[PDB]
Structure 1
Amino acid sequence: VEPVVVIDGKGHLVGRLASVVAKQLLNGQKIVVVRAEELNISGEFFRNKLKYHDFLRKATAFNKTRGPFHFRAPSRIFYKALRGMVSHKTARGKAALERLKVFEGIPPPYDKKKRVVVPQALRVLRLKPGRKYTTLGKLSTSVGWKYEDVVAKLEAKRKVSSAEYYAKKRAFTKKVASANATAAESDVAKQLAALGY
């Protein structure tokens, strides 16, 4: 219902998130994904590292610059999963993929925007407790990504600023609720309560 839907990628399962995002893009929804380094894949870390090393094995023999390109970033891994589900060699597929942005962390201006979740792709709702799962940032660092520390530091600074903003917002919200509660006995409030508001 929003012109742009921003999805916080933390705690999501990569395949189901890719499926829902690809369907939304093909239907014509603009989507931005943040915090791709906090994505999850079901299964053990060595299983997913083995799968990525099989992908690393895949390469064109007579010229390595022509073969499959192995992008190491978590957002790029998610983009690979999404492009595998979008028919990207057609104009419609390209137009759908150009409605998507994926980022590590939460860069501006999305650090001051509302961020949503997709319940059908959340790990805590989908995976059975006791099942093992992998963190995409750790997998990317193991397979060659080199920016996990900088992302962590920037995210910590952003969290400090966001916590200050939320403290101010909570104080204002408590003041607003107190000001609204003192008019609960008025005739206007009684009529609104009778009408359901």
Structure 2
Amino acid sequence: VEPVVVIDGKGHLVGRLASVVAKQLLNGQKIVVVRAEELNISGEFFRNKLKYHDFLRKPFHFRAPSRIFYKALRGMVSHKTARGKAALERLKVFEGIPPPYDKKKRVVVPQALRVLRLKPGRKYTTLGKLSTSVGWKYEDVVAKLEAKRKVSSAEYYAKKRAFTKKVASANATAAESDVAKQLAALGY
């Protein structure tokens, strides 16, 4: 339905998000993933640092959270095939929200959120912490310039809220009229 979909990785499970993205873009849907560093994995820090060195001690290994997510997505797609290679060309993963994706709406997957999937009172791991612990050196800059992203975007939202205030006032003053009642009668 959407020519390009931007998915906010924060608060989502790596496995569920990877599976849903693989299924979606295997059907030709273009998907973009942002804020991968904020992606979460179930379980406390231990047993999440583990199971990574286990396969590491075997090739080339990538420490960036985006590369980890791609590897998770890569194994869920029939790579080495033209369809698999073509499907993987419709995927983009970045840390934070670099432009121009910062100026566009970002969606989430209800069936992949940690809150809706993980039972309360259970420890969970975050991709950023694991990446830093396994040698990632860009967490500091990622956080620093993500905080700046919220800066002045709060101001943009405030301006939008102010504009919508005037829009609502204009609607209300024109409301209750004959045309307004006619529209409300037809569910609009």
TM-score normalised by the chain length of structure 2: 0.98
Question: Structure 1 residues 102 and 131, CA, compared in 2 at 3 Å: closer, same or farther?
Answer: same
The offset of 1:67, in angstroms, is 7.0
Within 2, Cα distance between the matches of 1:67 and 1:139?
Answer: 19
The offset of 1:155, in angstroms, is 0.5
Within 1, Cα distance between the matches of 2:47 and 2:58?
Answer: 24
Gaps of 5+ in 1: 57-65
Residues 55 and 70, structure 1, Cα contact 8 Å, conserved in 2: no
* Residues 24-66 of structure 1 deviation map (CA, whole Å, 9 limit, x = unaligned): 111010000000000010011111101111122xxxxxxxxx9
* Residues 67-111 of structure 1 deviation map (CA, whole Å, 9 limit, x = unaligned): 732100101110000000000110000000000000001000001
Residues 7 and 31, structure 1, Cα contact 8 Å, conserved in 2: yes
Within a 5 Å distance, the mapping from 1:78-117 to structure 2 comes to 78-117=69-108
Secondary structure of 1:20's aligned partner: helix
- CA RMSD across the alignment: 1.2
Secondary structure of 1:190's aligned partner: helix
Q: Count matched residues.
A: 188
* Residues 137-177 of structure 1 deviation map (CA, whole Å, 9 limit, x = unaligned): 00000001100000011101110021111010000011101
Within 1, Cα distance between the matches of 2:58 and 2:22?
Answer: 25
Secondary structure of 1:46's aligned partner: coil
* Residues 96-135 of structure 1 deviation map (CA, whole Å, 9 limit, x = unaligned): 0000000001000001000000000000001100111000
Residues 44 and 133, structure 1, Cα contact 8 Å, conserved in 2: yes
Q: Percent identity between the aligned chains?
A: 99
The offset of 1:8, in angstroms, is 0.6
Residues 11 and 38, structure 1, Cα contact 8 Å, conserved in 2: yes
Residues 12 and 123, structure 1, Cα contact 8 Å, conserved in 2: yes
Gaps of 5+ in 2: none
What corresponds to 1:160 in structure 2? 151
Within 1, Cα distance between the matches of 2:41 and 2:16?
Answer: 10
TM-score normalised by the chain length of structure 1: 0.93
Secondary structure of 1:7's aligned partner: strand
